[PDB]
């Protein structure tokens, strides 16, 4: 638990504009899809948006992904296909739009990290949902002698003061950084022909060695072409 993952979620859901941070439970099924309510003075019957309709073209941070109700899981799986949430409830037949990006943070099975236990044994999620994520991480927690002094001098160096870095670096202020990244999104680069050969041969490598194991061991099968589109 102590790899400080919530700090990054509050962080990047504070740098990006239009970024919504929702915990596990938390929002209901109707809280993060839209609902219908009567409108005062201007009329009438507007679809009041939920969490996901609020934060589109942004980043939707999510805590505690395992504790979600299963209807919310199918909502997220409908966000994994683009643009689409479809509703057939008592007064709605619509197909609203959502162009969001999802960052999740799921915990393993209790307690932590048994190398006796297999992968996906300590994971409470199906490998289809592992295939919908093109990039998957894991943050271990192993006691090690050398890093502890750097970590202790790091943390106690900030409770001692209020700024961490030194020798030789200054942190970029976030407003100028948002000006940089906001400038960066107007480029649309174009690929070429040598990168065609290199991407193809690398995909032959990953496809080739990924399917010669075929086991429930520490290997993760079977390197779907979503990794190719993701890379």
């Amino acid at each position: 638990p102590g790899v400080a993952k919530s700090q990054l979620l509050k962080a990047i859901c504070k740098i990006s504009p239009r970024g919504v941070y929702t915990t596990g439970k938390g929002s209901s099924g109707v809280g993060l899809t839209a609902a219908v309510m009567k409108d005062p003075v201007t009329d009438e019957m507007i679809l009041e948006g939920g969490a996901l309709v609020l934060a589109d073209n942004g980043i939707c941070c999510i805590d505690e992904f395992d504790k979600m109700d299963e209807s919310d899981r199918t909502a997220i799986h409908e966000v994994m296909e683009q643009q689409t949430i479809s509703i057939s409830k008592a007064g709605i037949n619509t197909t609203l739009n959502a162009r969001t990006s999802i960052l999740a943070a799921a915990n393993p099975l209790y307690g932590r990290y048994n190398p006796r236990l297999s992968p996906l044994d300590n994971i409470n999620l199906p490998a289809a949902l592992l295939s919908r994520f093109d990039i998957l991480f894991l943050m271990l927690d192993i006691p090690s002698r050398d890093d502890d002094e750097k970590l202790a001098e790091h943390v106690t160096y900030v409770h001692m003061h209020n700024k961490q870095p030194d020798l030789d670096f200054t942190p970029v202020e976030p407003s100028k950084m948002r000006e940089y990244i906001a400038y960066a999104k107007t480029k649309r680069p174009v690929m070429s022909e040598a990168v065609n050969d290199y991407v193809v041969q690398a995909y032959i490598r990953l496809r080739q060695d990924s399917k010669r194991e075929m086991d429930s061991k520490f290997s993760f099968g079977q390197a779907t072409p979503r990794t190719l589109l993701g890379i």
Partner: protein, 646 residues
Amino acid sequence: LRIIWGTNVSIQECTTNFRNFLMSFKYKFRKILDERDEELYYIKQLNEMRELGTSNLNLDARNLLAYKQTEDLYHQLLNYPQEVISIMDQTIKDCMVSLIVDNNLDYDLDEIETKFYKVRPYNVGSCKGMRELNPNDIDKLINLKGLVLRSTPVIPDMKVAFFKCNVCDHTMAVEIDRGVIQEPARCERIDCNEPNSMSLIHNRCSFADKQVIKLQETPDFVPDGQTPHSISLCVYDELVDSCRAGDRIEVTGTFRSIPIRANSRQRVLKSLYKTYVDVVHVKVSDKRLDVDTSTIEQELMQNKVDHNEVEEVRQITDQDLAKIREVAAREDLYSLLARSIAPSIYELEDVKKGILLQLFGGTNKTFTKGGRYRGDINILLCGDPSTSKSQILQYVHKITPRGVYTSGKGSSAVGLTAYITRDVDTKQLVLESGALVLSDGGVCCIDEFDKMSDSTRSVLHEVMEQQTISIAKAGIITTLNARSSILASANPIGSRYNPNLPVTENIDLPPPLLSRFDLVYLVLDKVDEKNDRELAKHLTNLYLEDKPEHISQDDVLPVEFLTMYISYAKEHIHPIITEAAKTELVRAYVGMRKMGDRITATTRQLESMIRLAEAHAKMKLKNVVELEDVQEAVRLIRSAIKDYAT
């Protein structure tokens, strides 16, 4: 020079200059279209208006752009609809008079000159959608898209009034023209005095037709983060009953704004006006998506002949019909058409081929009493994820004329029919159509077929079997049909399919219900290496040179030949499956029954084989079936059967 007070128009320049437009038009719209029949349009279309007796000429707007002069009249038209439309009406009538003085003995000249002719323009731009519209732009012309939810009943409108007295008795009458109707207090008989009572007999006067249709649109290039929206529009006389519940319509009309009362009791007209549309021309057919059937339409084929209207069916031209009879002579049509469906997804040509055969569905035979046999076929496809199941469903959702796309765990037993609700603008109890009545004729789609309830999925035992729906609750006790071609998909427990495990076990369905579906695919993955090179070369073929080129080598792909090919293959063919194939068909069915002692085979396989077989015979323009081609109609199940060994 004369002018009108609200505007800058003049009657002379518009009249003479538009008269100068209707006598010369030589494909300048092609001079913008870059050229890739030399006689002008409106003499031909004015003759088609002339001999057939139909009214209602209609023209485009880009045609008014392309000609020079009258580049000016377009910008006059887009701003000022009512006055300019009245002017074009007057000069059309005088153009008919200026034609009839050529032969002098034409059509009993008085009444056909007397009959009202009118203009319906369309295609007047589409820059910004419904949301952006400022109150600066009140009265203009607007294009919209999107479907249609419900349809109010007919309400009349007074055009003529009618008065009497009790003394003694004389019967004057009065018109409307502006907003109000004045009535006299005195007199008739004597006129003058006495000031007798003036009654109104409201069973004698003229009336009109006013129908209100509620709409929901899909305004592309969204102003993020926009949510969907609802407009209400108010069609008039001729266009009554020109819109069902479900179609995809592109509308022109005039944006209006009229205040409403408060609480029906005082005269306090509330501020903060209400907006609506006031339609002019309805555009149902289209040239990019599919075209509607004919066995469904036949009630409104039986109607709509007494009163002249719009076409509702794509007009098949004559020149390219020769190209239809040319492409029908191709031998490789059975892999060419199935190859040309989804040119961005590349496997599963049996599945592409079955999706082609869902568009040619069966033969509609009606008996004397009972029977009522449709051409429904129904396809499941499952297997491992990351297999582009969704791309197929979005593409079919684009092509289908009346498709509705639900999902799993977003349904209820209420959620597919009878949304009996409270409409706000009239404050009564109005009944809506749910999710399958909108699906009536066409293709539905359902994702995650595993994760329904028991209550939901108990709807489909009626729709798949009886081809009815039986609503019985407090609103309406009356069965109503929803013919539909259900397509669905499901993801297994694995999620990878593992061998040496029963096929029925790996998807959580009761195998009678899995046995009820016609064509069941099981798409799995191969660990070999040779295909993946061509796979990645297709992907990086798509990403490169930032232009849609996707498949041009070494292949010919029709762009929009296939939609009119399918519709022409849907009206003018009735295939019959007579004697000579019953030996092979019954022979193969009893051969299928041989396996006994996983999945089994019932009579739905036999019904499946005849309807899929004659669906193959609907292709390639043959009014009878042959003993040959039934074999691959068996092989479409046998490919899955070879995919059931593992």
